[PDB]
Amino acid sequence: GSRRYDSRTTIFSPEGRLYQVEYALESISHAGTAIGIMASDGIVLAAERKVTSTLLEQDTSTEKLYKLNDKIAVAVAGLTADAEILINTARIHAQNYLKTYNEDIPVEILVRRLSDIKQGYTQHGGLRPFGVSFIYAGYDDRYGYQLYTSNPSGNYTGWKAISVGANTSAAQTLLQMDYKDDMKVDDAIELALKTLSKTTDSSALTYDRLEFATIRKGANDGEVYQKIFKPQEIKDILVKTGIT
Template identity: 70%
Template sequence: MGSRRYDSRTTIFSPEGRLYQVEYALEAISHAGTSIGVLSNEGIVLAAEKKVTSKLLEKDSSEKMYVLNDQCVTAVAGLNSDAGILVNTARVYAQQYLARYNEPVPIEVLVHRLCDIKQGYTQYGGLRPFGVSFIYAGYDDRYGFQLYTSNPSGNYSGWKATSVGANNSAAQTLLKQDYKEDISLKEAKELVLKVLSKTMDSTTLTKGKIELATVSKKNGKIVTKIWKPSEIDALLKETGIVKEENEENEEIN
């Protein structure tokens, strides 16, 4: 009952020093599909649970993975509509930086820019926090491959392996157990699929229920890639995590 006096305005602190609207945004994210990122010396792997699965959807449609520029990909957890405006902002800023300085934007600078915007939406009246968390996977010449997360409060942090969304605690525990410092890109792919298979609500991991993206280096050039369902299916069969395809008869509304 006491919180109702303070939760109708984004900018009002409760007597305990809490901003309820920010906490509500974080709670919304905790119910979103799990997204996972793993960093290796050879690149970065992002994987996410796809909540809406239907045979009527376009096969290559993506709701969780977005390319921000030629060196950065992001996975989202939360409200996709909120994510869309921030993704567009990041893309514009990345191109403006490239035009001004004639070099790709450093990954942390890009993350910092988005977090400044998110923080502003916790501070001014008439606005609400963005209900979305991001996992950023990118590369720049100074720090190499980097993995960051950010949340509605505007905080961000760097990680070797991380997760956001539903079943976050279980996913983090599994990542702590199985992550190793010298992990290869191939092992990182296997790890994210293994963690997703144990934390998703569904009992079977199939190409229609997950999205996958990678940032890697090939012939000295950075390659950002959002995987197609057929490529995910081949990877699942290669790793032995899925034995058969049974998604055609399954639809989640």
């Protein structure tokens, strides 16, 4: 009947590799670059927009930096439509954990669940996996500042700075060169843009092609303040570092 049309996506190849996983990664190297630099007292998230025109509305726009709850944000690299389903079960799962324990969910648990959901899509069901990679940038009280990435495999690991999207080889080479561990949020701001000026496909880096975001311990009391920069604050930070 319909035996013929099956792609049989989920079987191994003779080498021991999952075909659909290897492709999804290649697809993800076409999406605009995203970079995370973790410092002692905060996290920077800078992502290079894709699609731009003098006729595109930019100020209200939001295509790569999404907020999950109070203290955790992500950056998307890949199919923005596919990701929008994985962002909605992340929020739901977060508040469901707040409903049952009365604590902000630990960063380790909210990562581990979105990787099980990715893994479970290559295990069975014959569906093509999501084409997404996340940079989970989050803060709990247990370990302080954390970074995580996941891949359409499911596998996830922690990083002090990492790149996904285009020129991850080129961007990862620069980042190893300049990273240091005494860094502060304002040095990391400077490094994240310095890496994006060199890897950019643009003839010149410009404020209207950036999505920028910090999570600082800074801000009143002990509480943590997440700040997705306005389009206008990015023009100021871009003259401050003197790239323009």
